[PDB]
């Protein structure tokens, strides 16, 4: 089995309060957390998965643990209200990854961006190459609404990995009615 610590980042931004992902993005991203946490259980027991709130200020109430029981409890009453903040949410998983006791687990991050963010192409390429020096492979999954056919996050994913490095891949989410289990179909198949 592949060894790594997957830190999933829930999206508390104010644009997660609608139902485009059925029935509602609160329960949809919950089901999106349900499918990733149950998949790691089918993958490796040693993988420990925490949660982090990106919007407003970053706070982690659940220590990194393989048990997803406390994670599923925090998915309720998450109160998705606040301003989305991206740049601070990249290393936010990496700092919890620098607190890992075992160093054999690879550094892997999955973040949920459901809101348009104001960012310059020079800011995302500096964080990209910074993760190249840190070897961290971050799989981002587009959620919510954002710049049509997202460029920044795509350039953030594309410039994040290279040769090969298998890798970081971004899947653009269509702005249409769908079930959250149908959104993750492509990303969970091929990261």
């Amino acid at each position: 089995m592949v060894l790594e610590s997957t830190m999933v980042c829930v999206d508390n931004s104010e644009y997660m309060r609608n139902g485009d992902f059925l029935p509602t993005r609160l329960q949809a991203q919950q089901d999106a957390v349900n499918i990733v946490c149950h998949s790691k259980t089918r993958s490796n027991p040693e993988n420990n998965v925490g949660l982090i709130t990106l919007a407003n200020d970053c706070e982690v109430l659940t220590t990194l643990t393989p048990d997803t029981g406390r994670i599923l409890s925090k998915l309720h009453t998450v109160q998705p209200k606040g301003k989305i903040t991206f740049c601070t949410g990249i290393r936010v998983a990496h700092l919890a990854l620098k607190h890992r006791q075992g160093k054999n687990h690879k550094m892997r991050i999955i973040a949920f961006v459901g809101s348009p963010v104001e960012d310059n192409e020079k800011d995302l390429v500096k964080l990209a190459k910074r993760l190249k020096k840190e070897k961290v492979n971050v799989d981002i999954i587009n959620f919510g609404e954002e710049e049509v056919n997202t460029e920044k996050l795509t350039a953030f994913v594309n410039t994040l990995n290279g040769k090969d490095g298998t890798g970081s891949h971004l899947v653009t989410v269509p702005p249409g009615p769908s079930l959250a289990d149908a959104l993750i179909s492509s990303p969970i198949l091929a990261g």
Binding site: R17, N18, G19, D20, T24, E145, P175, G176
Partner: protein
């Protein structure tokens, strides 16, 4: 259901262009773009018969969606009540939206501010303060939005219209000037706000100071566009004090409501000099002669008693009066605000205590360091 928006499709030029997207908003089941576009229609001035026909379906929207915050539900209904014009049948629907919507975000603070806003036709003074006080009780925690606090000031400012403790209006203005940083409303509306704000705040004497934050930047930007003679007489109560021509100037332009408080505002400038003349000067020079009070405050000898002894109860000076020579002695002091010449006047007489004491303190260190070792 889709045919309901097709007959309301074209309301005029440019209306269908944004409505073609509106029908694809709920079919895609995205309720944010549907919230903002309806809010954009709510922001768009209308009669409005468009939001009044959809309020039945918007009511059905909140039912099965159950998520989207009532803040958007309150913003749309306040444009609808303008078409309804009847506060009675609307408050039954307003409380209906309060009981049907329960979320971690408080729905009572946004509804109670909407209840009192529609309560201006009741007209006021009876059941108002009950629903007004209920706002900040739930708003005490957690006032993170801070935007609803402006709606809390509205019904609180209209509660003052009964007159109504003028001194509380300037204190209620703190719930406005402190609710939101940026104006976000036409300054011409706020230049007629400081019109009555400076007057009424000066009228009611329940507030003894009233000059603490009168230098605040956001209100003084309004005081630049506001009538200049009203500000020059506000500086008389802000600093002043006399300035006998300016304290009369407020009775020149605005005649009404100042007739009862005229002789009273003539008293406030008389207690405003007692604190300043000892504050401006280094003194002491503490005990003061009655002729000096009879000069500045220009009051007769028989009335100096009531003057300075009333300041004893106000709390600006505790100094007892020496009635043999009729000289009024001062104790403590009341500081008010500050000026650019006050800092320069400070560095003169403040650091002078620093340079005089430390100079002779070295003399204590010099000679007496031998007996210590």
């Amino acid at each position: 259901v889709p045919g309901f928006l097709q007959q309301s499709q074209s309301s005029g030029p440019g209306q269908p262009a944004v409505w073609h997207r509106l029908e694809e908003l709920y079919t895609k089941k995205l309720w944010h773009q549907l919230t903002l576009q309806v809010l954009d229609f709510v922001q768009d001035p209308c009669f409005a018969q468009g939001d009044g026909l959809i309020k039945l379906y918007e009511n059905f929207i909140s039912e099965f969606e159950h998520r989207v915050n009532p803040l958007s539900l309150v913003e749309i209904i306040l444009h609808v009540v303008r078409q309804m014009t009847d506060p009675n049948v609307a408050l039954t629907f307003l409380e209906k939206t309060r009981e049907k919507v329960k979320s971690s975000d408080e729905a009572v603070i946004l509804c109670k501010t909407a209840i009192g806003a529609l309560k201006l036709n009741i007209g006021d003074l009876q059941v108002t303060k009950e629903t007004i006080e209920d706002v900040e009780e739930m708003l005490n925690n957690l006032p993170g939005v801070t935007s609803v606090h402006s709606r809390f000031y509205d019904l609180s400012s209209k509660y003052y219209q009964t007159i109504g403790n003028h001194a509380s209006y300037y204190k209620d203005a703190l719930r406005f000037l402190g609710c939101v940083d940026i104006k976000d409303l036409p300054v011409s509306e706020q230049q007629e706000r400081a019109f009555t704000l400076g007057l009424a705040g000066l009228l009611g004497e329940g507030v003894f100071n009233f000059g603490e934050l009168l230098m605040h930047p956001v209100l003084e930007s309004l005081r630049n566009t506001d009538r200049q003679w009203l500000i020059d007489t506000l500086y008389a109560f802000n600093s002043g004090n006399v300035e006998r021509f300016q304290t009369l100037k407020t009775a020149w332009g605005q005649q009404p409501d100042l007739a009862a408080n005229e002789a009273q505002l003539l008293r406030k400038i008389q207690l405003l000099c007692l604190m300043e003349m000892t504050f401006t000067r280094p003194a002491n020079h503490r005990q003061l002669t009655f002729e000096e009070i009879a000069k500045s405050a220009k009051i007769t000898v028989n009335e100096v008693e009531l003057l300075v002894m009333k300041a004893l109860s106000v709390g600006l000076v505790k100094g007892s009066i020496d009635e043999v020579d009729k000289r009024v002695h001062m104790t403590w002091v009341q500081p008010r605000v500050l000026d650019l010449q006050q800092i320069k006047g400070m560095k003169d007489r403040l650091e002078f205590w620093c340079t005089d004491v430390k100079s002779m303190e070295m003399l204590v260190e010099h000679q007496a360091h031998d007996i210590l070792t």
